[PDB]
From a paper:
The baseplate is a complex structure at the tip of bacteriophage tails that serves multiple roles, including host recognition and binding, cell wall penetration, and ejection of the phage DNA. We have determined the structure of the baseplate from bacteriophage 80α, a representative of phages involved in host pathogenicity and in the mobilization of MGEs in S. aureus. Phage 80α is a typical staphylococcal siphovirus with a 43.8 kbp genome and a 63 nm icosahedral capsid, attached to a 190 nm long flexuous tail that is capped by an ornate baseplate. Here, we have determined the cryo-EM structure of the 80α baseplate at 3.75 Å resolution, allowing most of the baseplate proteins and part of the tail to be modeled in atomic detail.
In total, 72 polypeptides comprising 7 different proteins were included in the final model. In a complete tail ring, one of these β-sheets forms a 24-stranded, highly negatively charged β-barrel—42 Å in diameter—lining the tail lumen, presumably providing a slippery tube for the DNA during infection. In the Tal trimer, these helices form a twisted tripod that occludes the opening of the lumen. After accounting for the plug and rod helices, there were three additional, well-ordered α-helical densities forming a second tripod interlaced with that of the Tal plug. This density matched the C-terminal residues 1135–1154 of TMP.
Numbering used by the authors:
A (entry chain BB), F (entry chain EB): 4 to 169
B (entry chain BI): 148 to 441
C (entry chain BC), G (entry chain BD): 1 to 314
D (entry chain BG): 2 to 147
E (entry chain BH): 3 to 147
H (entry chain BI): 3 to 49
């Protein structure tokens, strides 16, 4: 009962004191939390001791002229820059003394993969896989004004005919 | 500006002039030095340098700087002293020749609120402010990347007990490090002057006068008042405490700076000044230099 | 995960010097046995068995900002660690696998970065590491190679080794336990009662023929190299002076005449009759504290006994 | 242009000194070029901003200058005027004084302008006189009573 | 975030890293300033306040905000400003602001502006004289005396 | 919001002082920037130290009679010739004092694979995978006249009937 | 990554000779211990512990234009490196992992190629490598095999080894530190103040009973094989001459009469009374500089002391 | 500007002194550029 469009992605470069940057025009998306069971089994029983996680998140996108962000992602992959990213779900606001904040999943890592593709007379898309350093942290997060105004994204409001407006 | 000589100080004790302060309404210099051990001397002298008397604070710490307040012709000295090797106490007292130590003769000021860490003070009478330098512990320093922080507060608030921590500001390490230790502070006109020096020639000692309101850096010059360029008596010059000399009349503020020159077991304490068109002149012309004859 | 080293004249810790460490692993003590096999008997006699050496291993790597600096950093490591000079190693752990905490991506509450390009998860004062235990180890270095993985990351494999005695020397004497002056140096690995001045903390008795001692150390302090040191005001004049002890041997001092107020400093296998001019001909026997109750029995009610020692562990 | 040499040698030699030298020369050229560009944008550069980059606020009416010029041209090309007489419109135009605030009469406008200028220049002269008096006092201060 | 003009006096890795970070920061700060100026010059909306920019006519200096407000006030007055008896208005405006009826409006305006200009020039001469006297007393160098 | 047709590929052989050579009739295209995280994890934490990248770029093409370039690519593959190549995006020109230059991604390497295929009554296409030595460099690049005139690529302009023109 | 070698009579560097190298890895010094285990005591005495050897490893490969030439190249390598002749190795690093820079594919700004078929990323003068540190190593070669991977690429695995003393001998004396004449040979690994003529640079004092010395070398210069060499104009006549020193032993010269203006050259374990005819019978004791402050104390205010030495590192 | 492009070629404190002086000039210059820019942007008159 939840459309994906609602979920939103925010990125930021760690050692940069600026507001996050939304990721536009991502078609697919995925978030895998694997586990490796450090289990030791007696000869007369069984036990699990620990777990080494291998979390990560995958995404696609479509490379529109306006933003140069994909270039930043690429520079990261090739330069091994640490980025902090969080998906902040819209339409799930805070409960107690929190209204502008929104549910989220905050995590940082390095972009372990990036790869584009393009065909004739076709939009040029790409796919990035991003690691996750350790465990992630959840917490209600607020969005930056920029992301808020983008979220609206109204399209071609009513104009007029015979030269009043383009 | 370039500093200008005023005088040399003649304390009858061989140690470094850890700080100094002259009084406007009396024309008398109180200079603090740190003796072997935690105890420390403060010598009261004439403007030319002549020795009037002295006091020895036992277990009084280094005594890097002390605040001198006038409350209706009553001279209070705010100081940093510890007793019985317990902890640092910030304490008021009155000048008295001879010896003193923390007890019945000295009364603390709001101990419960800032006797958790090393603390010292200065006084600015124009604004009636008591600037508290307050050191950090090692554990807090590990995260703060700094040794000390300065608080502004009002002397009337301190008197009637109310606490106010307006205009608090940390100091980065580079302005208080081992090669650039503190060695002196003074507040004036929303500007904190911080004068540091390495007790070493060619390690340029200087001041780093900045602003307390907006936490920035206003200016940073060089200082070579030891004498002739890169040739000072002995083998080392050391910067020492600051003073902002006001005047009850002709409110022309000048900045006095202490320097300590000469070899290992013989010291020369000199006072230079950056003036305001006549302050230094009047300061030196209070009384003449001593000569063997008339 | 810092591997503190107290050398003769200084204190060092690696992570202060840009040297992260992966872990520390401390072997047990190599038990050298001394068996003898009888010729035709299905069993071999134990002549002896004895602890020898506690080989430590510590792999540490380091990152820097540029490839050249590697060299400098490596040299620092060698100049900082590889010391035949018997050093005192202290281990450090963390209390938690720390993560980055929640923040706010509103052009504010940005993240910090260490002097090395890493994310500072240590936000508060109470984040950084701790001396996990109040003990040390007398330690010397053995050969290392330095494989350089990519970039500015290079690994090292320190192989430390015990120097004199394969034991976990406890830092601080037993008198700092008595007088609660020095703070730190007392970890819960040692099951120590809080009742300072109560039993099993006190090593300062008065006017007693016999008394009780709780040696908190699991390993036994029979070896003289340990800093077992006694000093007694004898209380009563005598010509001979015997004192017995359990988990140890009997001790006599015969053939020399003493006096009451005279004091004996009884160091390991050594006897100062009055602090100097050692009179140690009489019954060369050294006392041995094993663990827990070590009851002593004097013979003429010494007016004072007190003795500091060091706790050793296995 | 060519970037600075971020990474220097790890040994003091002519190479290390030359590296710092070359980096400083490049910094001097960069700073000079930026200052020149700034002065050129500030004084000589034509068609720097395209109007819309400018603010215009008055009477709590914020808007861009390039939009307000269009608004004024529109209002002017829609303005209607009648031949009221042989100068009525002319005097009605003159009734303002450089800041709007249409006066009811040209005479009132002239009186207000002259009064503003008199008050301004007279306040200026008063400031001059008190400053000169202060300077003479501060210079020739001979007050042995204090 | 800012430079380190307090260099280490032992020539170690600290010093070299300080110098390297210093040059890196200089390059970063400079390219940031260049991009900032370019953004200002091309795309920054409301880069300048309207009071700033100068509109120079013949022998006349004024801003653009003031001039635009003046144009708007002109329009407003010409439109919704009551009018009439212009001849009487002019013949009454002929009088000056002290109680003397001039002969013509232009002569009145001329007299008023000449009075103001003379007063201002007298004030200016007094100011220049006072300043010159202050300079000659302050930076006095007369080895004749 | 970007048609791939816009992007353009330029090639050149390193030790050759000539202008670049466009790659005509490439259908697909791809550019993968993998990463290998040289990470060392403590027993009480985790860390990333470095990253070994394995960048590369893949492409297809269609082997028209006119150009012999594919032969050069093949000679490179089999003979291990160093080749410098850059994708120079059209319709994204320079910003400051740069108008003919175009955004780009310049990288050098060896062609680690090349493979054609062909079916009955079908155009004969091929696929090449090209390594990337280390990190690539971005920077506004100008095109050579040859590529510019090719870019136009107008088709069968208006001719006339009844023998006026072929 | 060039592996410079200064031999007795020449200077060589591999990459000049078409010999790239993959890396250089320098082991630490093999600490030979000398323990003694007491028979029934849980602990073993340290008789001694001592540095021995600093084994270097350097794998270097080489490409050529044709398969035959491999042979020549290989022989050159052997004839160039495998020298029992104690050589002085100097390590080299780069300051950056250099890439090819942006260019323009407009039949211009083409790329360069080295003498070996590789891409010259070193466009500017300030690209090529550097003597990463102002030290050397006294070194000898050990056995190599030469696996030939395909083509003209062949690898080699040099295994070098320290010759006399397992230390990082600093090139250049301490007087070149005094007189800033020779340039180079002073890397930031040595924490050296710029205040030439100031303290902790000067090893040339005059008219002093006692003075101060900062030995910048982490490793201690107690070994005589190091080039510690003192020379003193004695200042004042005497019959005996004692001078003390810290981090070392006391030194006497008794039994021989001296004069003021006469000078002593005090070499390691050796004494030239007046430059020749060594009078070294008096108190054979050699001085030892450990690190940092090494305070000396003469007894009659020598009119001159000055001493050059070499800094050694671990 | 006013920078020392002829540094001491000798391992002495004059080198670091002139380096620190150069950096002080650079810091002051960048700061006054930023201040002048801000002034021109939103404080200057007749910019
Ligand atoms: Fe502008």
């Amino acid at each position: 009962m939840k459309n994906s469009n609602d979920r939103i992605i925010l990125f930021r470069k760690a050692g940069e004191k600026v507001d996050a940057t939304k990721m536009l025009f991502l078609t697919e998306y995925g978030l895998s939390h694997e586990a490796d069971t450090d289990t030791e089994d007696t000869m007369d029983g069984s036990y699990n001791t620990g777990g080494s996680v291998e979390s990560t998140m995958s995404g696609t996108a479509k490379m529109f002229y306006g933003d140069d962000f994909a270039d930043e992602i690429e520079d990261a992959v090739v330069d091994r820059v640490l980025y902090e990213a969080w998906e902040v779900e819209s339409r799930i606001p805070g409960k107690n003394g929190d209204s502008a904040k929104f549910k989220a999943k905050y995590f940082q890592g390095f972009h372990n993969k990036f790869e584009l593709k393009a065909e004739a007379n076709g939009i040029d898309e790409y796919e990035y896989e991003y690691g996750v350093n350790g465990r992630f942290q959840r917490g209600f997060a607020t969005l930056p004004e920029a992301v808020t105004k983008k979220l609206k994204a109204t399209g071609y409001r009513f104009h007029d005919t015979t030269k009043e407006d383009a | 500006q370039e500093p200008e000589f005023i005088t040399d100080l003649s304390p009858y004790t061989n140690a470094v002039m850890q700080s100094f302060w002259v009084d406007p309404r009396t024309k008398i210099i109180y200079m603090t030095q740190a003796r072997p051990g935690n105890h420390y001397m403060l010598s009261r002298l004439k403007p030319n340098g002549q020795f009037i008397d002295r006091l020895l604070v036992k277990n009084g710490g280094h005594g890097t700087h002390n605040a001198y307040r006038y409350i209706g012709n009553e001279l209070w000295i705010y100081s940093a002293v510890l007793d019985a090797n317990e902890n640092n106490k910030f304490v008021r007292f009155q000048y008295r020749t001879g010896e003193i130590t923390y007890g019945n003769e000295m009364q603390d000021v709001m101990p419960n609120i800032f006797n958790d860490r090393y603390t010292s003070a200065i006084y600015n009478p124009i604004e009636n402010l008591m600037i508290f330098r307050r050191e950090y512990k090692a554990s807090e320093r590990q995260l703060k990347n700094s040794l000390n922080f300065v608080e502004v507060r009002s002397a009337d608030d301190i008197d009637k007990g109310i606490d106010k921590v307006l205009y608090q500001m940390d100091i980065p390490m580079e302005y208080t490090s081992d090669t650039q230790p503190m060695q002196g502070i003074t507040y004036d006109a929303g500007i904190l002057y911080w004068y540091t020096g390495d007790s070493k020639p060619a390690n340029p000692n200087y001041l780093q006068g900045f602003d307390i309101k907006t936490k920035e850096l206003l200016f940073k010059r060089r200082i070579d008042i030891g004498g002739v360029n890169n040739n000072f008596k002995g083998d080392f010059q050391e910067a020492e405490g600051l003073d902002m000399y006001y005047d009850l009349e002709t409110g022309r503020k000048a900045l006095l700076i202490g320097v300590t020159i000469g070899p290992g077991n013989n010291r020369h304490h000199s006072i230079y000044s950056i003036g305001q068109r006549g302050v230094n002149q009047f300061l030196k012309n209070i009384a003449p230099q001593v000569s063997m004859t008339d | 995960d810092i591997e503190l080293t107290k050398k003769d004249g200084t204190v060092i810790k690696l992570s202060e010097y840009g040297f992260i460490v992966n872990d520390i692993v401390i072997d047990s003590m190599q038990i050298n046995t001394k068996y003898q096999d009888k010729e035709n008997m299905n069993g071999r006699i134990l002549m002896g068995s004895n602890y020898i050496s506690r080989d430590i291993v510590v792999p540490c790597f380091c990152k820097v900002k540029n490839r050249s600096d590697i060299a400098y950093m490596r040299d620092m490591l060698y100049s900082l660690t590889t010391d035949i000079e018997p050093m005192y190693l202290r281990e450090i752990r963390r209390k938690e696998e720390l993560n980055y905490r929640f923040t706010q991506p509103t052009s504010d509450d940005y993240v910090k970065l260490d002097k090395n390009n890493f994310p500072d998860y240590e936000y508060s004062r109470h984040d950084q590491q701790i001396y996990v235990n109040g003990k040390q180890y007398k330690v010397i270095f053995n050969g290392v190679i330095n494989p350089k993985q990519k970039g500015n990351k290079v690994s090292f494999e320190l192989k430390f080794e015990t120097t004199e005695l394969p034991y976990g020397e406890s830092i601080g004497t037993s008198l700092e336990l008595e007088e609660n002056k020095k703070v730190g140096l007392w970890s819960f690995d040692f099951n120590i009662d809080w009742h300072a001045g109560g039993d099993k903390r006190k090593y300062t008795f008065e006017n007693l023929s016999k008394g009780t001692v709780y040696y908190h150390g699991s390993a036994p302090n029979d070896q003289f190299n340990m800093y077992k040191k006694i000093t007694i005001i004898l209380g009563e004049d005598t010509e001979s002076f015997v004192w017995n002890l359990t988990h140890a041997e009997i001790m006599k001092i015969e053939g020399i005449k003493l006096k009451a107020g005279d004091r004996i400093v009884y160091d390991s296998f050594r006897v100062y009759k009055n602090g100097v001019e050692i009179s140690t001909e009489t019954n060369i026997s050294q006392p041995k504290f094993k663990y827990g109750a070590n009851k002593f029995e004097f013979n003429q009610t010494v007016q004072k006994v007190q003795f500091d020692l060091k706790f050793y562990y296995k | 242009d060519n970037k600075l040499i971020t990474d220097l040698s790890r040994v003091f030699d002519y190479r290390y000194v030359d590296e710092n030298e070359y980096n400083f020369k490049l910094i001097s050229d960069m700073l000079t070029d930026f200052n020149f560009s700034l002065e050129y944008h500030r004084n000589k550069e034509v068609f720097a901003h395209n109007g819309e980059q400018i603010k215009y606020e008055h009477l709590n009416v914020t808007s861009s200058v390039s939009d307000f010029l269009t608004y004024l041209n529109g209002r002017f090309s829609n303005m209607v005027l009648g031949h009221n007489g042989d100068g009525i419109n002319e005097v009605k135009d003159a009734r303002v004084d450089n800041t709007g605030y249409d006066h009811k009469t040209l005479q009132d406008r002239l009186y207000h302008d002259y009064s503003t200028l008199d008050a301004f220049t007279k306040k200026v002269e008063k400031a001059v006189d008190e400053n000169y008096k202060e300077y003479r006092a501060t210079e020739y201060r001979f007050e042995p009573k204090e």
